[PDB]
Amino acid sequence: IVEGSDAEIGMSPWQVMLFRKSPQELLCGASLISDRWVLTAAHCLLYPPWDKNFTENDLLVRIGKHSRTRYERNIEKISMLEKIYIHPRYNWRENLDRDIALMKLKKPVAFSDYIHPVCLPDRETAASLLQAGYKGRVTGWGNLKETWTGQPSVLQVVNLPIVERPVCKDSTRIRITDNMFCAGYKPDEGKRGDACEGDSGGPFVMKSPFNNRWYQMGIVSWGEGCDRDGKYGFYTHVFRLKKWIQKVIDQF
């Protein structure tokens, strides 16, 4: 994450790391939405252009983590994955439409001061909060700047406002859909920041001014570089795909 800052402790207790087992490698961010259920970007698990095609056994998550350059005994929990579910209309060929996946844990994780699920938005939560100029929060251990294909010690956090659908479309030749939104400061807004490669699957969250709860509105999906004037980060639209998450969840 670019031009962000160190998360305070337990600031994002739903933050999940997704690792390759062997060799042990940090792939992506995720979000905890129940004791059994972790949410991430589909392209963290399946992207044939990078011959990437992970199964349940290939992978492991670490929950309740703050530092990667520490081990956090009796704080961080590690869980294997029982099943991976990719959105059946995930589209990697074109524009990453429905860039969403669910991983179910082998053992349900214990909630602590450091591990706690984020809420998923309802109708009204999407109406009231997902509006242009309104600011959510992005987090992750991803890249610190744009580079070629920046590891930070501490979880990173940046607040970024949502951008009008027409400025998003004008920013890029990439076709965007209703299942996506874009966030970040306009050039000549004066503030900066962005998610980056590595931050994919991490949550874009907003605090409801009604019931004090944190909601996951977005999943870090895509961009062009990181933090360029006149470019914005693109987020999987969590509300528009909620019924799918529900079909998958209501069915163990």
Binding site: G10, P13, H116, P117, Y134, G136
Partner: peptide, 29 residues
Amino acid sequence: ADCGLRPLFEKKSLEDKTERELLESYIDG
């Protein structure tokens, strides 16, 4: 169910360092 409330912040009536910036974003034109 009891989701979205951080043990170390909401549940202790304590606020993080930048959460007011989000609420200010909702009220601003």
